């Protein structure tokens, strides 16, 4: 079980990683197997609460969403050794949806044609000795899958 492989380089919240696990901390809240999924990304301490059913916010709507029927748990520890997040998006993200596109966000009537400027902004915004709330908090989420078939855990 490569649980030590999950906990040098991490991925941003907008590009969160999921890993297929089979046949094997400041915040720890459980809510709820054939399959278990390891979600690893990073958000600041303010947005840790976004990883929960019944959520609203920049991370919840446009970066990472929980299915409101979560049968799993959320793991996270303190300040991070070594980050992007999606700020501009037209619609809310679906549960477990991942958005990679870097297309210029069109906030006006005229289109952008890939050029940043008036009413045309990059959807992704860049994230020591500051408030720990705004310091990165690595977040690990485990999703449990249970269907009518042989289990693998």
């Amino acid at each position, epitope marked *: 079980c490569p649980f030590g492989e999950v906990f040098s380089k991490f991925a941003s919240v907008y590009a969160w990683n999921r890993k297929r696990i089979s046949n094997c901390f400041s915040t720890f809240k459980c809510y709820g197997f054939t399959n278990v999924y390891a979600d690893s990304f990073v958000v600041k301490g303010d947005e840790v609460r976004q990883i929960a059913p019944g959520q609203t916010g920049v991370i919840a709507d446009y970066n990472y969403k929980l299915p409101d029927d979560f049968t799993g748990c959320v793991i996270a520890w303190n300040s991070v050794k070594q980050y992007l997040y999606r700020l501009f998006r037209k619609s809310k993200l679906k549960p477990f949806e991942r958005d990679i596109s870097t297309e210029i966000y069109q906030a006006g009537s005229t289109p952008c044609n890939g050029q940043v400027g008036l009413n045309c902004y990059y959807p992704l915004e860049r994230y020591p000795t*500051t408030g720990v709330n705004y310091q990165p908090f690595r977040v690990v989420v485990l999703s449990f899958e249970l269907l009518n078939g042989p289990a693998t855990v």
Partner: antibody, heavy 117, light 108 residues
Framework: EVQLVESGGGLVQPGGSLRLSCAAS????????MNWVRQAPGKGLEWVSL???????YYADSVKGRFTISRDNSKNTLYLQMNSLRAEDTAVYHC???????????WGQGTTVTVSS | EIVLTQSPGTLSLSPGERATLSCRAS???????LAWYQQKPGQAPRLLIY???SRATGIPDRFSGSGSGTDFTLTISRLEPEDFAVYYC????????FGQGTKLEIKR
């Protein structure tokens, strides 16, 4: 072309209801963070409501359970439904485009709301 | 929540002087969520500085932002006669909040 115009303000007795209209041109209401910021006579700017591009709506503690903010795609108009209007709500209401990191760059002249019997 | 306090209530200077505007944050806060606004009488607020020291488009270079942590400073290097207005500082968190504002009057 890029401009915000407010309308719908008027005279409302205490405990009444009123709805404000913020017509937008040049910018799309549904694609931007929309904010309502009011200013009491002789006082400073006070944030009121916030609607996300994805539909999430945020409100201040003093306006919780009383104020609701909506929008119209077909009209490109931002709405703010106000209920249980106390004397605190006598102010001029502006609608502004909110770039979160980049601040609020576009502001309208606003409309006037007075709460008095 | 985030509370912003501006000091002092009224700043009294004369044209050609340097204005040091202070906005105090009761808690340590991000340096990219602060905006400085100028509001002349009978007009809508105008954004001057976003983030911490970034000027908005069309803002004259005499306006300068600074500060980090809990203390931030808005600086006008040379005061033009039409720079006398009320200046506000803003922070966001989850819901935007504003300070009470500082009035710039003419020294006499």
């Amino acid at each position: 072309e890029v401009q915000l115009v407010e309308s719908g303000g008027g005279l409302v007795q205490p405990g009444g209801s009123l709805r404000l209209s913020c017509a937008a041109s040049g910018i799309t209401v549904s694609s931007n963070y929309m904010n309502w910021v009011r200013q009491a006579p002789g006082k400073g700017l006070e944030w009121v409501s916030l609607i996300y591009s994805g539909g999430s709506t945020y409100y201040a503690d003093s306006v919780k359970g009383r104020f609701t903010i909506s929008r119209d795609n077909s009209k490109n108009t931002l709405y703010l439904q106000m209920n249980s209007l106390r004397a605190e709500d006598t102010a001029v209401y502006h609608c502004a485009r909110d770039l979160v990191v980049y601040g609020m760059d576009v502001w309208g002249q606003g409309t006037t709301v007075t709460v008095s019997s | 929540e985030i509370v912003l306090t501006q000091s002092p209530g009224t700043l009294s200077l004369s044209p050609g002087e340097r204005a040091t505007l202070s906005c105090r944050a009761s808690q340590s806060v991000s340096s990219s969520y602060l905006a400085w606004y100028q509001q002349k009488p009978g007009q809508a607020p105008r954004l001057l500085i976003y983030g911490a020291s970034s000027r908005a488009t069309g803002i004259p270079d005499r306006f300068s932002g600074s500060g980090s942590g809990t203390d931030f400073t808005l600086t006008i290097s040379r005061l033009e006669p039409e720079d006398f207005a009320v200046y506000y500082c803003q922070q966001y968190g989850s819901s935007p909040t504003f300070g009470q504002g500082t009035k710039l009057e003419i020294k006499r």
